[PDB]
Design a protein around this ligand. Structure first.
Ligand SMILES: O=c1ccn([C@@H]2O[C@H](COP(=O)(O)OP(=O)(O)O[C@H]3O[C@H](CO)[C@@H](O)[C@H](O)[C@H]3F)[C@@H](O)[C@H]2O)c(=O)[nH]1
Ligand SMILES: [Mn+2]
Length: 342
């Protein structure tokens, strides 16, 4: 099937690094056309994109006017511009070019060698399982010491929409466009009114990496977390693997049985590396305070969006800690997310 890569650009000439990697790894120009939508009108960036010639299709957001923001958002004009550009660019992909799906890539992302193979293999899963609403290349807890380098092929389901290199179907754009927000589009997608309990597929080792230290948002999140996400460099032939384990019926039975069948260990024991014979354990949290405390003790992201933890699935955050597989999980009685967990 034909899956365009939609690159979102504005005023950073480093879109060059993004395009160089996409073009280098692309296995087929026909199956993966690259459409670069540029906002802002930055001349140098426009010239950089134009220099690729027919290797890409350069389109330009037509409305470069300032946006009237609400009273609580004087400092956030850039976020309103991002949202406006996304609406226009996705509209071009799905209404003008009329493609069936698209992989959205921001201009400050460098892709892994198997980026295209990954989406080619997972597109059919997204097509077939209505409980999934996206496939993402990003592991929110993908720092080097928290991922298993021996399992570059391992994938998971997550309730936390990761963005940062993601595939969506034209069917999803049909649902989202009528109510597209004025700003903060990704946190808006993370709300239950939008997500409707659907999950995304995400990898053990990220297939994208961001190098955009300077951008719309202040660089502290990049400086303290994003910059440490490891880019996969070992090519995995996903189209040759059996990915049926990701179907909801199979995953919710087998993965949950795995998590709750693992021995429970106190957070302190995991921290100090006690009982190393247990290569896979569960650390149980029972409230917002314990979740935050335990996540911090083990070095994983502790923030929540609409009550959902980073890379969480049914409240479970899975990662590696000093070589051990750890599932930070709620009691098995878990029955939904609580948006008040902030
Ligand atoms: O005027 C503009 C300025 C930038 N853009 C584009 O929006 C995209 C994100 O911009 P940028 O990378 O600078 O912002 P970022 O600091 O990562 O955080 C935002 O993006 C994050 C998600 O990746 C999100 O969590 C956060 O709330 C965002 F602020 C990128 O592709 C730009 O080219 C645009 O179309 N028009
Ligand atoms: Mn960025």
């Amino acid at each position: 099937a034909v899956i365009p890569i939609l690159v979102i650009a504005c005023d950073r000439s480093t879109v060059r690094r993004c395009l160089d990697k996409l073009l280098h790894y692309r296995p087929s120009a026909e199956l993966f056309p690259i459409i670069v939508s540029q906002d802002c009108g930055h001349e140098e960036t426009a010239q950089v994109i134009a220099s690729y010639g027919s290797a890409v299709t350069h389109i330009r957001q037509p409305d470069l006017s300032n946006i009237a923001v609400q009273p609580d958002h004087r400092k956030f004009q850039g976020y309103y511009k991002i949202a406006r550009h996304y609406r226009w660019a996705l509209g071009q992909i799905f209404h003008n070019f009329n493609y069936p799906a698209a992989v959205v890539v921001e201009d400050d992302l460098e892709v892994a060698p198997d980026f295209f193979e990954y989406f080619q293999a997972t597109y059919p899963l997204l097509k077939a399982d209505p409980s999934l609403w996206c496939v993402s290349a990003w592991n929110d807890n993908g720092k080097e010491q928290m991922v298993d380098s021996s399992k570059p092929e391992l994938l998971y389901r997550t309730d936390f929409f990761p963005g940062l290199g993601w595939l969506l179907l034209a069917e999803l754009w049909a649902e989202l466009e009528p109510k597209w927000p004025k700003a903060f589009w990704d946190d808006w997608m993370r709300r239950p009114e939008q997500r409707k309990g659907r999950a995304c597929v995400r990898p053990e080792i990220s297939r994208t990496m961001t190098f955009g230290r300077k951008g719309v948002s202040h660089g502290q999140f990049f400086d303290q977390h994003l910059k440490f996400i490891k880019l996969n460099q070992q090519f995995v032939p996903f189209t040759q693997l059996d990915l049926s384990y990701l179907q909801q019926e199979a995953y919710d039975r087998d993965f949950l049985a795995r998590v709750y069948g693992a021995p429970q260990l106190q957070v302190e024991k995991v921290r100090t590396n006690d009982r190393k014979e247990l290569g896979e354990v569960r650390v149980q949290y029972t409230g917002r305070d314990s979740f935050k405390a335990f996540a911090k003790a083990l070095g994983v992201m502790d923030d929540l969006k609409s009550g959902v933890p980073r890379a969480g699935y049914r409240g479970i955050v899975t990662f590696l800690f000093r070589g051990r597989r750890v599932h930070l999980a709620p009691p098995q009685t878990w029955d939904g997310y609580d948006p008040s967990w902030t």
